[PDB]
Point group: C3
Chain length 487, copies 3
């Protein structure tokens, strides 16, 4: 019936940042689904030296890193009485400053690195690119198309970590009604997105998304066009777009405040100087093709730059054929910028991402005069070394409209109508409601993907905004489910 075969690359020695070519062989009558398999090599950063006290130095992202003298604030000029500074590692072990080869930075991967690895995919027959897509289309259609019963396998395929459940012991935890033992549940991550001293090799399986990769009845015949000209070209992402560093050194500030009660504060600040990650190798580069032994839906994509104030119209130039539905996302440029220290986390998000920061502290309160006992004698406040960060994604688009030749066809729907209500009502089991508030769905059929036969089809797109200005530019990603004909 069918069999999976491995194909080696036609290029030879693929590298991060360059192109990669596969040639489809002559094995079966049909072939429908293809998957790419790569293994990214192990990663670590270089050894660095601990600084002397009262030293400075330029760090990551154009930010000053400083190790102040005793008796001063975080800046080395302004005095702060009773301040002592030491050096720790990210887990609290001392460092003894001035030591050469003292510490090492930690390394981690981007979120969903298998979706970021294939930066551009195109399919050629004597030139003549029959289909072509990028990674923004992949991240936009994951949020609508992958069901949720398939999500934990997809995260294993693209190299995204999953949280693991753990339990504590029993507790007392009384019941009030207007006693019973009870157990806490905790969650913990361990994968490639967790900063480690050494990352293990990472196996990535990337599903190819063409029109014949979807169904078995739309598989192209192997002898209808010869095997000597069918190629698949993939432009890969660079190493700097895949791996990132975490600071391996922290400055610990202990401060005594005299008085009643005497307070003792402990705070932490990262010392982040960028090192050199070793160059990642690519081994076991393979393409698994499912050969079969015995109209079409072309995903049409377009990305456009936007920098105007308060409202914008863009005409859809590349869209040609009749369209059943489309997915629209406005992604800020700063989400994929190298000046963003949260590019590793926000590259696939379609809104403005802010960060809530919780700094949990331990507090203690000791009294010993034995006779005063109104106010205590000593207070202790100790912070954790790194805080807890919560990403909050806010939508960019306030109102949206999609206009035809002359008529309006949508008169300024609010963005929650297209982000929440249209995926809730339309689609059935094939479309889920996304967690991202910036991903929107526009429908033109009453049953978009519950069935395979067109139930309706079909050019400006206009929107209002508060975010976009001259420096806060954005990109508009449009992925439309068109209909074409193959012969």
């Amino acid at each position: 019936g069918f069999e999976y075969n491995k194909v080696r690359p036609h290029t030879g020695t693929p590298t991060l940042g360059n192109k990669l070519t596969f040639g489809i062989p002559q094995y079966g009558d049909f072939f429908h689904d293809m998957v790419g398999h790569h293994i990214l090599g192990a990663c670590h950063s270089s050894w660095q030296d601990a600084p002397i006290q009262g030293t400075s130095q330029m760090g990551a992202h154009g930010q000053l890193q400083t190790f102040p003298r005793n008796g001063y604030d975080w800046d080395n000029q302004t005095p702060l009485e009773g301040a002592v500074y030491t050096l720790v590692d990210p887990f609290g072990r001392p460092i003894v400053p001035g030591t050469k080869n003292a510490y090492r930075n930690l390394v981690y991967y981007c979120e969903y690195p298998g979706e970021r690895l294939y930066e551009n995919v195109r399919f050629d027959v004597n030139g003549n690119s029959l289909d072509e897509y990028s990674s923004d289309v992949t991240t936009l259609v994951r949020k609508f198309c992958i069901p949720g019963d398939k999500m934990t396998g997809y995260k294993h395929l693209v190299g995204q970590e999953v949280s693991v459940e753990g339990t504590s012991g029993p507790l007392l935890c009384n019941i009030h009604d207007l006693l019973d033992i009870r157990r806490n549940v905790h969650y913990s991550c361990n994968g490639p997105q967790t900063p480690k001293y050494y990352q293990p090799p990472l196996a990535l399986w990337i599903k190819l998304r063409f029109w014949f990769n979807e169904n078995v009845n739309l598989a192209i015949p192997s002898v209808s066009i010869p095997f000597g000209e069918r190629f698949i070209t993939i432009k890969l992402a660079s190493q700097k777009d895949l791996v990132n560093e975490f600071p391996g050194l922290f400055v610990r500030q202990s401060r005594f405040i005299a008085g009643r009660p005497s307070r003792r504060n402990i705070r932490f600040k990262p010392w982040f100087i960028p090192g050199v990650i070793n160059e990642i190798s690519l081994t076991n580069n393979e393409l698994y093709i499912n050969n079969l032994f015995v109209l079409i839906r072309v995903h049409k994509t377009q990305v456009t730059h936007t920098n105007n104030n308060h409202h914008d119209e863009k005409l859809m130039s590349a869209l040609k054929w009749p369209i059943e539905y489309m997915f629209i996302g406005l992604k800020p440029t700063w989400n994929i910028s190298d000046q963003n220290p949260h590019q590793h986390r926000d590259w696939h998000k379609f809104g403005h991402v802010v960060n809530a920061i919780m700094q949990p502290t331990h507090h203690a309160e000791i009294s010993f005069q034995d006779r005063d006992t109104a106010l205590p004698d000593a207070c202790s406040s100790i912070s954790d070394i790194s805080p807890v960060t919560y990403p909050i994604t806010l939508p960019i688009i306030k109102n949206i409209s999609v206009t035809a030749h002359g008529i309006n066809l949508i008169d300024k729907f609010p963005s929650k109508f297209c982000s929440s209500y249209i995926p809730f009502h339309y689609g059935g089991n094939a479309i889920k409601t996304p967690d991202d508030p910036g991903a929107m769905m526009i429908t033109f059929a009453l049953k978009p993907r519950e069935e395979y036969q067109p139930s309706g089809h079909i050019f400006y797109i206009s929107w209002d905004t508060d975010y976009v200005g001259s420096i806060t530019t954005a990109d508009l990603v449009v992925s439309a489910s068109a209909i074409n004909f193959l012969l």
Copy 2:
């Protein structure tokens, strides 16, 4: 094919607690699905005064609030040696008692406020209410009918908050087998159910649930009956059923216990005097109707009061047509009572809700004599200001039976057979197993909603109970999927 149109209300200036009328216009050939859009205005509470020490006052829900003198317990009569009382805000900042306009209460919304806003919905043609439902039917059919891939969009539509994931830094966390870096996962909420000083305006999208709102093939024609008489009447909930207060003042008790070791306890108690929330405005009241350009299933509902001991029978008077399946829920009256301080959380639950309370405390232990060193010198125990509350829902019904004209047809199934096994086996993808243990499903067809054609159809309902008495009365909500005929 189809187009969404907005309809303004026929009433003019809608208010919370009153009725609201929409008139269906003459635009298309058919219309099937409708959604109501409202925006609830911003909310805050009034400024209040800090009390003097030793003062009392009647608080929230008929409960005494007291600020005791130094040297006494929480009651102002019984003496407790070494007790000092101060006033803090909910985040630990001092208040300086006697100050006028010192603090302000916090405000929040009920759980799922979009489901509670439409208290009653009916559909009129020259009078003659063709369909009518309430909010208990909506909360009962959400727990069975909304799939789960659609749940995070539905919560955005009805104004229910979602938790946001955050991560910490790396940790040590050794491995035992019979070392590796690791990261904690935390969750945090931010929405309208979180108590804040100022609630932002809340946009609500409420889907209307009639028989023609379900399918496109059952859309009623626009010219078959004229547009001059079709009305939709909605009775809205009041403001006191939507917003609630959280105490903005706490009394902090610091207690020194002399001895070996000397202990220092810090506890907290809320000072909760109700204020005046400003009156909520309703703007942008709209009805979005999907007009189409070119037998039935009527949900039949009934609610009945119940107050008998140990067992009860109720005859189903309103049920007329043949019934494919039904959903049954016994909801206690105290879940929707105004004397319940947890009405904001328990109004949509179909069981007895108790509260587990965890009070997490920080403990510290200091020894200094340097020569005794067996037992410490000082202990510190500091509580958090507000505890962690876990709602536990317990079922009311022990055994259930549904009897026909003369025969029994169900002979005392235990309630877990109808709450868990019947939604697990029957329904397919259209029915999920609910988290609420008081929501039960009775089937009469072998395939209830996998298909659209009747596979079986069809009156007392009897049950055993331990909860229901004279003062712990309850309501029986029945939502049945009947079959009628439209012409």
Copy 3:
């Protein structure tokens, strides 16, 4: 149309560890689905005596339990200066050693005890076992077949606890962009897997899995074979395979380390001597049969022992008919061993399970004096009594192959291709991707369970491994969806 009837057992007084027989009566024309209902009685452990100081004793799983003298380490020989040992219960209350009937162990159930209760199920007609399965097949097909919208009802049916959400009060939690109130979310368990002093009676509903229990169109007729010979035989699990103990006594070590600063450590160690759990009773043993009033797919299973190095081949002897797909799992023997203290948790897992252990400690730092103030005067470090345990499951099989008569048909796919990609691409809504990395799916049809008609069918199974040796043996569980014919 249909009606559920209860059938009492034919055995009389069933016990844990023995067999149980049901006889199918003569009530309807057809019958398709059956469910078994049992109630396991209440559980507690015996009263034990607190040991004297300096005493030892052989504890649980061949491990020495010791209560050391003051001034020594955990071993009673090596000296440790400034160590004091006391006895606490699991919640921190003192015990006063030497007391007779001082404490009691805690009891809990295995994970998914309803899946472990039916250790073997077979269906007899005059002898002649038409179908037969074990509990490993049930745990293997739960991970693929139960959807996820049905999972919380299934966990209520088989007696597995669910976590309950709770919230804290509001917090400060400033926002950084490159202030707003916020609430924490916590989770907590309360069910039969939580160690308690007294376990309540546990009601178990176990669905029977035969070919006629799946569909209504494949229901066997009641008069086609007589009611006098159809039997269902169930071998039940023993009590030692169902309930387990948790230690009710801990040794608390308080240690003073003199110096600058003076440190005070508090650690805990369990004193675990096994007691006698009372014998569990079985009441309300019933079989609910759905009688109907007016080709086949036989699950073919095989388990084989394996102990070879680095690679293995096993021939599939029992597999006869054409096979649409199969599920394969390699489960270590130590997962079901009685020498494993984590048998209660790992019996249903198909990999090597290691344990990460987090020991959260409270730390405090006090400085009196007032003139030195560089380094503190006293440090406090207090542990929790029991730590937080995270199970990590690692796969045993590295590469897998399934060979036909002469040809290879699979040439060493890596195990993530069969654990993740094949459930992701094939199956549709009927197959989900499992969380267990050792459960693998092999397909032979292009649409395994999206439809009911065979879309392809069909013997060695070989694999590479790093885990399996002479003492780390394993079992191979194969559950295949064959096709047979009934007449």
